[PDB]
Amino acid sequence: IISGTSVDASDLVT
Amino acid sequence: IISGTSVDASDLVTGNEIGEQQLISGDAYVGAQQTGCMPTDFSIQTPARSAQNRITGPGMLATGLITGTPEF
Amino acid sequence: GIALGMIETRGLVPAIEAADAMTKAAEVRLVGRQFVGGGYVTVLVRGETGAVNAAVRAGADACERVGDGLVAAHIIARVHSEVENILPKAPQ
Amino acid sequence: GIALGMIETRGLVPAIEAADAMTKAAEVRLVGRQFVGGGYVTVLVRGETGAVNAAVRAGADACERVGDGLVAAHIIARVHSEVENILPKAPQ
Amino acid sequence: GIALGMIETRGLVPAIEAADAMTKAAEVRLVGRQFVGGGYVTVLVRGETGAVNAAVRAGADACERVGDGLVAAHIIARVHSEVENILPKAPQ
Amino acid sequence: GIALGMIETRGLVPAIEAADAMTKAAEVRLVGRQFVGGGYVTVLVRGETGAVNAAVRAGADACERVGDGLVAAHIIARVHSEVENILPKAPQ
Amino acid sequence: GIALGMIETRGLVPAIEAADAMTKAAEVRLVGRQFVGGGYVTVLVRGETGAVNAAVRAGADACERVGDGLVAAHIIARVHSEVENILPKAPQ
Amino acid sequence: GIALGMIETRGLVPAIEAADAMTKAAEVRLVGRQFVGGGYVTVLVRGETGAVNAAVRAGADACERVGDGLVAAHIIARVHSEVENILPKAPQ
Amino acid sequence: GIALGMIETRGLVPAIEAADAMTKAAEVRLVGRQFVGGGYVTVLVRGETGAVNAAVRAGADACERVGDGLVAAHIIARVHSEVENILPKAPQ
Amino acid sequence: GIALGMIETRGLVPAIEAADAMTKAAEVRLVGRQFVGGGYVTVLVRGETGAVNAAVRAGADACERVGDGLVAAHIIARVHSEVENILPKAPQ
Amino acid sequence: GIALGMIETRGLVPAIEAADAMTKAAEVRLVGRQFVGGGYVTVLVRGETGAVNAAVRAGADACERVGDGLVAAHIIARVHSEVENILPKAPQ
Amino acid sequence: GIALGMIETRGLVPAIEAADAMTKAAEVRLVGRQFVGGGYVTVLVRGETGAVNAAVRAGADACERVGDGLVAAHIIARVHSEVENILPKAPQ
Amino acid sequence: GIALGMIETRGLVPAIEAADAMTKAAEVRLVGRQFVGGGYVTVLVRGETGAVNAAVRAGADACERVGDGLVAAHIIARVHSEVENILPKAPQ
Amino acid sequence: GIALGMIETRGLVPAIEAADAMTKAAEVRLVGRQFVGGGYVTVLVRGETGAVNAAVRAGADACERVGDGLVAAHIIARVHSEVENILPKAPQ
Amino acid sequence: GIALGMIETRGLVPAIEAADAMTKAAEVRLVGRQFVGGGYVTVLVRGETGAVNAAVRAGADACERVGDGLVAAHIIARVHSEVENILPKAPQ
Amino acid sequence: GIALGMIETRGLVPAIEAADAMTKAAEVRLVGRQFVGGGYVTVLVRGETGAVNAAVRAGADACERVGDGLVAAHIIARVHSEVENILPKAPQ
Amino acid sequence: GIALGMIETRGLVPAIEAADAMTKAAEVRLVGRQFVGGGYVTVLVRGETGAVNAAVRAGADACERVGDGLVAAHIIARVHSEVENILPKAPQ
Amino acid sequence: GIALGMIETRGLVPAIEAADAMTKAAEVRLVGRQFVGGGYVTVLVRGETGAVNAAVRAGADACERVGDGLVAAHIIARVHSEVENILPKAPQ
Amino acid sequence: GIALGMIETRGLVPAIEAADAMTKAAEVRLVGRQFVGGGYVTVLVRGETGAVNAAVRAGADACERVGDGLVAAHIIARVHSEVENILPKAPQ
Amino acid sequence: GIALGMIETRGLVPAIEAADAMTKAAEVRLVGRQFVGGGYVTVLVRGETGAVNAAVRAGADACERVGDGLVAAHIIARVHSEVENILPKAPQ
């Protein structure tokens, strides 16, 4: 699936 | 009981009411009566002061996985 | 000083009582008397802050019951330079 | 700034309060004081629409309970060139 | 300054404390002390009305529990040129 | 102006508002803004005693609900000639 | 523009967010960043009263949930000339 | 690139972990480390947008549990030119 | 010495007891005995702060139960330079 | 004048208040004021053990309820020569 | 070696203990001591990954009960070249 | 000497008490007083091992109940030669 | 003035009404009229943020019930320099 | 910048807001604004892929509730070299 | 670009499909096709981060149903220096 | 260093993730990647024993969930001179 | 100063501790040591009254549990001139 | 190498097993084997800290069940430079 | 440093631990290690007396649980000239 | 040496034993033997703080069983210059 670095949103990032 | 001219706030006067009942410390021209008649803590918050006035390392991760020569 | 006391009244008889009271109570200077219209007279004094507070509490009590009465008694501790253009420098 | 802000009050003591409040609250320009008659005094300020809006809001609260009180607090963002003949260019 | 601050006390101890608490508190000058008789001592300070009131307040607060107690604490914001004769103008 | 007036705040935003309300409320002179460390900011004014009292009541009301708030509002009508060494003379 | 807008935040990451939001939202001028102490950072913008009001409203929402958050969002339409000594002329 | 990643932490040990993580995860440049005060340290990186998103998700995860923790992790894809004056160009 | 001790008493006998006790209890100098009026006699000593404290406490104990007794016992560790003019320099 | 009095307070306002009270209350010279970090400020006096024991008592009374308060009120009756290097000199 | 072991503590006494414990325990060189602010002090050593692993274990245990204690202990087996700029080279 | 004694405290007043007790008890040398931030003040003494043990014992007892108190009393009879580059040589 | 105000309407009669209302209501500058297509017409004004806010509020009410009506009333306090290429400099 | 980003809107007012939010959200370059006929307006941006994705999410959220609304928000990370003929290169 | 994106699928066919898709979808360069063996084929794309993420996602969606399937689609933000040597690095 | 680290994986995509992680995490050289057969790929990293431990743990934690996964993570701190003839000296 | 402080102990060891604790504690001069017979040793000090009160308390606490301990610790603030003959002037 | 490893055993036969298990386990050098007396034999190895860690664990596990057994297994990651004089360099 | 510290131990591993801890704790020079027989080993150190006390108290603590443990830990502050012949004297 | 070590004994035989035991245990100087009376004899030695600690411990052990015994054993590591008058310079 998505593998490697996650460019997706994370709760922490603002 | 101050006598003579009074510098304390009065009903008729306007514009001098600001901070009338607020308690301001120190020598006060304003009357004690209108303003009214021991802090032991640091009010502001510093994150380090607020929290508490064990080892993270590369070795720590993936403990279950490694096989090889053990160490102590 | 630069503080400003202003006493408005309904007439010149309650205003002269107020001016006398104010200018005897504290070290304030009578800078003006203005006839607003409608029977409203304003006596403006300029002194240090405590001086003007005392003067304007002396004026208000005095004129509260002389003639038609006292409308306003107001201290402005500092006046913008803009407002000084709309203020009387001497009483003539 | 071209906007007009105007505070009418019953008397001069509330008007001086409103003029100080207005000049202090924003970057408006005290442009005139007018004795209308019947004890109505109009203070007029000219500044940017943001400045005049900020000033007149402060002047309305300042002089609402000084002397007789506030008659009107009004803001005209742009005055017609015809109206500028009946507006004071500088305070007297 | 020409305002006067006066604290009357029953005894000398309560008036040397009031005189001390006065002159320390605000910008006043101790102009003198008088033995009125009957056990009354009056300490007087002449200073700007900018700070005279302050000293009186501080002194009164201080001598109110010292000795027999406080009798009077009076502020005059302007003294007439004729009361000046009945007031101690003292290097003391 | 020998009286000192001082507001301490939890942050610089209340301190700047206090410096604005203090300097616009009376004839005081803003002399110092200190970062005391820990998020304590002290704005110090120096004026006649009445000017300072009016300024510090106005500053305290202005910065009470701005940011974290007011820690202290304090007037000293005459400062010892030795405390004047630890007092800044021009705001930097 | 003479108006001041000031956003205090707990930390620098929220302050940089607020400064970007403010500069982008309106025609204000980023005039300084100050490390107060105790992890408070104050960003200050100078523009017209309409510009600064628009900017600070945007900066308050931008940095409310970035890092530790917003301490204060404040607007001073006109700063006294005394206060401009304790205000940064340019960012450092 | 000109995108901006910023990670605030409660300490320099969680900040160095974050800087290492961020600057190994993507093609980002460490432009600065700032000691805010109160124990707040900010590591700011500048890269292209995707690069900075990846770096700041790598930094946050790394330092989330090193020392006292992670306060903020924030990307600003374009920074006003105004904000660039308040940003570090090199880490010394 | 610069400290001042003072004991007011009802009569001269309690006061001579106070002066004797005070002046034997520590290194203080009797600088005055003052008949205030109304049967109040005040004895003043000037010494180091520690001597005046030991002395005034001794004088209070000695005269408390002699004659009509003690009215006040007070220490001013440093009198203002102006209070010195209202204070005796040697006994009469 | 070899003894040291020391008042630590939570803020500069309580500290200036203590400094004033201490210097006014006894024969002590104010040698320095130190910002210690975290919001602690320390006002050090130097005088005789009685002058100082009287000043530090007077100072702690002044600043106890001023601002965030008093942290420490300590007297060192003789200061070791080595400890004088870490002590502010009197021009402070 | 180019590994990085770093201990953050609350105060200097715990950190000088950590640095000493670490430099006694393994082949590491102390490269920096940092006062982060708000009572965080980070001591940093550069060595071989085995040495730094042995050094940070001994250092963390040593400073855990010294003073306010240990905040963080952290080894980075390889530091990116970019973090070398924010890393002290020799202790100042 | 090469033994190092270190007494951290919460404030400068508990650290001037600890430094006085240390320097008087044994033949040590104040090698530096440090403000670590957060309020922490460290007193570092260097003398012979017998002297430093006596001094730190005296210092820890003296400052335990002074101010906010003792955080750490810690002796290192010999620091590593790399731990001596992060140690002050002379007090500032 | 740099702010943009834009009123989109279904038709030109409502747009002319909105342009008159806007130009009359404030000191904005009619900067262009655009025929979008599908019977949408966009009038764009440029002035200060206070001026444009006042104008667009008036234009929205003026043309809400003229012809087909208002599609959009919008205010952009600051437009990016990129966007100014797709904005009309003068009306055609 | 080979990625293309495109927002289509029902009107020019949402399209101008989209062009403003897109060009302020990331390092994109606004290249085209087309009237497609029928009240369809397409603002086209060209930047790196992350910049474009950030820009188009920001544009879509900005213009969703402005006027008639958003028809389409669409990113194309690499455009064929033949589709680049039908793409404008500078906004007119 | 230094970033690497990799896709391993079961069979050459899914691999070819995904790789061609990647080349077309984003700005990535197909460095290589490697037969892992075990009927696993991996196709590698090295490009700037942006293109790499988009391409990898697209190829994954693209070859997912073709042939047996997608084992994995890893994305590396920055290759470490060493890994490159293992990686195919050629037009071949 | 002579310690060997080895990560067998089910595919080349988990292996490349492991080689990258190992190289970034610790000071290890990538000595080879071997296609064993059956879709098993081994990555061999030769460095110092602590370094190789850090590298293997980072690699395993990285490739554990990428692709088909991790088959083995093994360290051999000294390999016999015989096992050297079956180990690749440099990667291809 | 002429205050006498007198520690008496059972033995000379307790007395040297008392003398040293009295001299380090305050600004006092050791005026003599007497062997009275029967084990008793009396150290006598002379200085201002507060100097002596702080020394005779430091001495008593220091020697309280040393040797056979303390018999007497007594302060006399002024001694009769006849008691000066039975008091040593300098130690022998 | 710098790290020292040591296995003490009761008898030579247990020690030879530890020397072999240790040297086979990691890259350490057998620097000495010493007959201490009383049937205690110490085997000493010097290598990197990681190897000596792994080696000494191998030795302790091997010799524990051999013969009389193991007395001790110790690692000193860096002996003091003074302890080097009492450490063997080559076995005899 | 003509003092002597000695630590006898059951076995050599405990003794090398003692030598290391001793020479790491205080300024003591390792002069010799001896094999007494019966499994007894004696490490001897020489330095200032306090240093030797600290060193031998730290060596005992470290060597007490390693091996068969501590037999004796002793300090002879002045060794007689005769005993120097039976003492190792061989740092070199 | 400026540390003092005093042993007190009941009788002279224990004191001569202490003098001998102290002088032979450390590089200290016998400075005096004092007959305190009541059969108390004090032996006073002077040397560095470590030598004095060792010497006093030696003397105490030695004299504890000779004659009536030990009354005291005390160290003054730093002695005030005032106490040097009551201390014997040379045994006589």
Dihedral angle, C-alpha M58, M64, M67, M70, nearest 10 °: 100
Among Q5, I54, Q28, CA closest to J48: Q28
Shortest Cα–Cα distance, F13 to chain G (Å)? 6
Q: How far is CA C84 from the centre of its chain?
A: 15
With CB atoms and an 8 Å threshold, state whether L78 touches S49: no
CA-closest candidate to residue H18, choices R36, K76, T8: K76
Contact P67 A3 (CB under 8 A): yes
Which pair of structure tokens corresponds to residue O62?
């693209």
CB contact at 8 A, T80 and Q23:
yes
Residue of K nearest to R53 (CA): K50
- Domain extent, residue O55, equals 1-85
Q: Is O89 helix (H, G, I), strand (E, B) or coil?
A: coil
Contact residues of L toward K, CB < 8 A: 4, 6-8, 34, 36-40, 42, 71-72, 74, 76, 79-80, 82-83, 85-87
Taking CA atoms, H60 is separated from N13, O50, R12, in Å, by 39, 20, 55
DSSP secondary structure string, P4-63?
Answer: EEEEEEESHHHHHHHHHHHHHHSSEEEEEEEEEETTEEEEEEEE-HHHHHHHHHHHHHHH
Which residue of chain E is at minimal alpha-carbon distance from I5? E13
Instruction: Tell the residue number behind the tokens 């108006």, with chain if given.
Output: G3
Both tokens assigned to T36: 């305190």
Q: Nearest CA to D50 among G1, N13, C46?
A: G1
Alpha-carbon gap, residue N24 to J20, rounded angstroms? 55
Cβ contact, residue pair S20, R79, below 8 Å? yes
CA dist., res. R16 & res. H81, Å (int): 72
C-alpha closest to that of Q86 among Q7, Q31, Q11:
Q31
Question: What's the gap in Å between the CA of P14 and the closest CA on chain A?
Answer: 10
Cβ–Cβ gap I53/J50 under 8 Å: yes
Q: What is the largest CA-CA distance in chain L?
A: 35
Q: How far is B61 from chain H (nearest CA, A)?
A: 11
* Token pair for C17: 């009582």
Q: Is-contact K74 K56, C-beta < 8 A?
A: yes
Query: Is H58 an interface residue toward A (CB < 8 Å)?
Result: yes
Residues of E with CB below 8 A from I79's CB?
Answer: 16, 20
| Residue L1 belongs to a domain | yes
* Residue of chain B whose Cα is closest to the Cα of R50: B71
d(CA M18, CA M41): 11
Contact D43, D19 (CB under 8 A): yes
For residues Q45, Q46, Q51, Q55, the Cα torsion angle rounded to the nearest 10 degrees is 10
- Are J61 and J14 in contact, with CB atoms under 8 Å apart? no
d(CA P14, CA O42): 11
Q: Which of L13, L37, L90 sits opposite J42 (nearest CB)?
A: L13
Q: Which of D24, D48, D55 sits opposite G48 (nearest CB)?
A: D48
**Chain Cα centroid distance, residue F10:** 13
Q: What is the distance between the alpha carbons of residues Q80 and H61, in angstroms, rounded to a whole number?
A: 82
Which of T37, T39, T82 minimises the CB distance to Q29? T82
Return the biggest CA–CA distance within chain I: 35
Partner residues linked to Q37 by β-bridges? Q40
Instruction: Using alpha carbons, list the distances in angstroms from residue R25 to J25, R28, T64.
Output: 78, 8, 58
Residue C92 lies in a domain: no
Kindly determine whether residue B44 and residue J67, on different chains, have CB atoms separated by under 8 Å. no
Contact assignment for B69 to R50 by CB distance below 8 Å: no
- DSSP element (H, E) containing E73: strand E70-76
Are S26 and S82 within 8 A, CB to CB? no
Closest CA to S74 of S16, S17, S13, S18: S18
Q: CA K72 to CA F20: how far, in whole Å?
A: 43
What kind and span of H or E run contains F18?
Answer: helix F12-25
Q: Report the C-alpha dihedral over residues G51, G53, G58, G59, rounded to 10 degrees.
A: 100
Contact P56 B61 (CB under 8 A): no
**Burial label, L20 (beta-carbon count in 10 A; 0-12, 13-18, 19+):** buried
What CA–CA distance (Å, rounded) separates M70 from M14? 7
Whether residue S92 is contained in a domain is answered as no
* Token pair in block for residue I13: 């006998």
CATH assignment at residue H15: 3.30.70.1710
- CB-based contact H21:H62 (threshold 8 Å): yes
**Count of domains observed in chain F:** 1
Residue K80 in tokens: 């990116």
State how far the alpha carbon of J38 is from the alpha carbons of H38, J44, K37, L91, in Å.
8, 18, 9, 21
- J16 inside domain: yes
**For B71, nearest residue in chain R (alpha carbons):** R54
Query: Which of K16, K39, K68 lies at the smallest CB-CB distance from L6?
Result: K16
H-chain residues near N25 (CB < 8 A): 77-78
CA N89-M45-N52 angle, 5° bins = 30
**S91: which chain R residues are within 8 Å (Cβ-Cβ)?**
82, 85
Q: Q77–I49: do the CB atoms touch at under 8 Å?
A: no
| Cα T69 from Cα T40, distance rounded (Å) | 10
Three-state SS for chain C is CCEEEEEEECCCHHHHHHHHHHHHHCCEEEEEEEECCCCCEEEEEEECHHHHHHHHHHHHHHHCCCCCCEEEEEEECCCCHHHHCCCCCCCC
Q: Which two tokens stand for residue P26?
A: 């610790």
State which residue of chain O sits closest to N48, comparing Cα positions. O50
Residues of I in contact with Q3 (CB under 8 A): 26-27, 50-51
Q: Is residue L90 part of a domain?
A: no
| C-beta separation of K10 from B48 below 8 A | yes
Residue pair R74/S66 in contact (Cβ under 8 Å)? The answer is yes
- Whether residue T41 lies inside any domain: the answer is yes
Strands F70-76 and F41-47: unpaired
User: Considering CB atoms only, which of C1, C2, C49 is closest to F54?
Assistant: C49
CA distance R9 to R31: 16
Tell the burial category of H18 from Cβ atoms under 10 Å away from its Cβ (0-12, 13-18, 19+): buried
Would you call A5 and H75 a contact, using CB atoms and an 8 Å cutoff? no
User: Does the residue E91 lie in any domain?
Assistant: no
Residue Q52 amino acid letter: V
Beta strand spans in chain Q (E): 3-10, 29-37, 40-47, 70-76
Sequence-ordered list of residues with C-beta below 8 angstroms from that of C47, at least 6 positions apart, any chain:
C1, C3, C5, C26, C27, C28, C29, C55
Burial class of residue M24, CB neighbours in 10 A (0-12, 13-18, 19+): middle
In a domain, F90, yes or no: no
Contact flag O25-N77 (C-beta cutoff 8 Å): yes
SS3 S40: strand
Q: Per residue, what are the HEC states of chain R? A: CCEEEEEEEECHHHHHHHHHHHHHHCCEEEEEEEEEECCEEEEEEEECHHHHHHHHHHHHHHHCCCCCCEEEEEEECCCCCCHHHHCCCCCC
Alpha carbon distance H33, K76 (integer Å): 18
Q: Are strands O40-47 and G70-76 parallel, antiparallel or unpaired?
A: unpaired
- Residue Q83: both structure tokens together: 């008691």
Alpha helices in chain S, H assignment, sequence order: 12-25, 49-63
Q: Which chains touch K (3 or more CB pairs under 8 A)?
A: B, H, L, P, R
Report phi then psi at E28, rounded to 5: -130, 160
Single-letter amino acid code for the residue at E7: I
Residue I37: count of CB within 10 angstroms of its CB? 16
DSSP element (H, E) containing D52: helix D49-62
| Angstrom distance (rounded) from CA S43 to CA S38 | 16
- If one counts every other C-beta atom within 10 angstroms of the C-beta of residue O90, the result is 7
